[PDB]
From a paper:
While baculovirus and lepidopteran poxin homologs share <25% identity with VACV poxin, they are functional nucleases and retain 2′3′-cGAMP-specific cleavage activity. New poxin structures include the alphabaculovirus Autographa californica nucleopolyhedrovirus (AcNPV) poxin from Group 2, lepidopteran host poxins from the moth Trichoplusia ni and the monarch butterfly Danaus plexippus in Group 3, and the betabaculovirus Pieris rapae granulovirus (PrGV) poxin from Group 4. In spite of dramatic sequence divergence, poxin structures from each group reveal a shared core fold and head-to-tail dimeric architecture confirming poxins as a single enzyme family.
Group four is formed by poxin proteins from the genomes of several additional lepidopteran viruses: betabaculoviruses (also called granuloviruses), cypoviruses (double-stranded RNA viruses in the family Reoviridae), and betaentomopoxviruses. The new poxin structures trap a post-reaction state following 2′3′-cGAMP cleavage and allow direct comparison with the catalytic mechanism of VACV poxin. Strikingly, despite sharing <21% identity, each poxin structure contorts 2′3′-cGAMP in an identical strained conformation. The T. ni and PrGV poxin enzymes share the conserved active-site histidine but lack a tyrosine residue entirely. Further, the T. ni poxin protein shows substitution of the VACV lysine for an arginine residue, whereas the lysine is conserved in PrGV poxin.
Author numbering:
A (entry chain B): 0 to 153, 161 to 197
B (entry chain A): 1 to 199
Write the structure that this text describes.
């Protein structure tokens, strides 16, 4: 391919046959890891924190879920900028960050294949704050008794990433109203 | 009322009223491991800094759980209660592994502090990974073989085997959880931890 690293896009779905799925972009080759907790963006070094958080990226059919390392900056990173390690090897492409304050930003950088990853097929992940005690399929319940009623009373696959104040990431997959899996990742959620 | 019972009997009653731990039902939320120590049959055992992915089938659901490894020179009988240093029950002994004539290893769940995945209506299968790509219930050397399987399944799909779960590993490393249904791929979790047990 002529496009080595290509950000996700609806019209780039043919890249799934030729490129690896990173969280937010396709890559022709396996990318390098972060070395000594530093990333290099536009010629400036940025220390990488010890914090991680769950990020996600829809590519038009699948959702890539990835535990990424958090990088706190005092400067905005333009989207799709290449990220290098201190050995001048490309680590990835800049994805969407968050502006903490007027002069504060936080970006999430995937560190190769070192951390949690989940490739969800044919599902557009929904992220929402947990409002009740129990989450099950695409519904929420106050107690087990309300849950048993729904199960006995009960289209398409779905994926929901739950959090409470960006904490305790909880990923639920469901199909036709039935629960498939309920994974408590014990990680923060980025955003 | 059995407040802390191992998987394998009367699941209908337990599943509506008890919390699902990896291998046993508990009426209450169980205590955590305090100061990296568990107590089994009156003896204190230091808990290592190692974890591994374990699983337990209760007869309809599979509980997947990252557990903490405890090395011991003494065998722990199945179902023996496990306590913390406050004499608070933390669980029941599950199956371990024997590393040497004098050395054993058990995996102990530390409450709900670590990774936990509840698989509904599925019996997990553990398999050593032998090809580069895992997809649905199959393995493929490359994406061209994968694309053939996808396209042929799109043309004709006779798989009505239902929902399945496969835990892949390479020499007990690189835990990878594949969920699938009727020849379709659902989710591919890279857990990065070792897989516990005689595998
Ligand atoms: N992207 C990625 N992130 C990780 O964190 C990671 N940890 C390990 N690995 C393995 O590295 C090998 C490559 O050296 C891969 O094979 C992979 O093992 P696996 O995790 O067993 O593989 C499933 C393949 O299968 C891919 N697919 C999934 N669906 C499709 C589809 N419809 N069409 C084409 N490919 C599909 C899926 O994206 C994927 O392959 P790619 O990421 O390279 O694209 C990782 N790969």
């Amino acid at each position: 391919s002529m496009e080595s690293l290509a950000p996700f896009g609806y019209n780039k779905v043919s890249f799934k046959q030729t490129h690896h799925h990173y969280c937010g972009f396709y890559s022709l080759n396996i990318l390098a890891n972060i070395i000594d907790n530093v990333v290099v963006v536009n010629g400036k070094q940025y220390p990488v924190s010890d914090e991680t958080a769950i990020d996600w990226a829809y590519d038009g059919v699948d959702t890539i879920v990835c535990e990424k390392r958090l990088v706190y900056t005092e400067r905005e990173w333009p989207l799709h900028t290449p990220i290098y390690n201190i050995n001048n090897q490309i680590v990835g492409l800049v994805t969407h960050g968050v502006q903490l304050s007027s002069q504060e930003y936080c970006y999430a950088v995937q560190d190769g294949f070192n951390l949690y990853n989940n490739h969800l097929t044919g599902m557009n992940l929904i992220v929402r704050e947990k409002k009740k005690l129990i989450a099950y399929a695409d519904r929420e319940f106050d107690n087990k008794s309300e849950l048993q009623i729904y199960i006995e009373e009960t289209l398409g696959y779905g994926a929901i990433l739950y959090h409470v104040n960006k904490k305790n990431a909880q990923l639920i997959l469901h199909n036709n109203g039935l629960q498939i899996s309920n994974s408590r990742l014990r990680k923060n959620v980025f955003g």
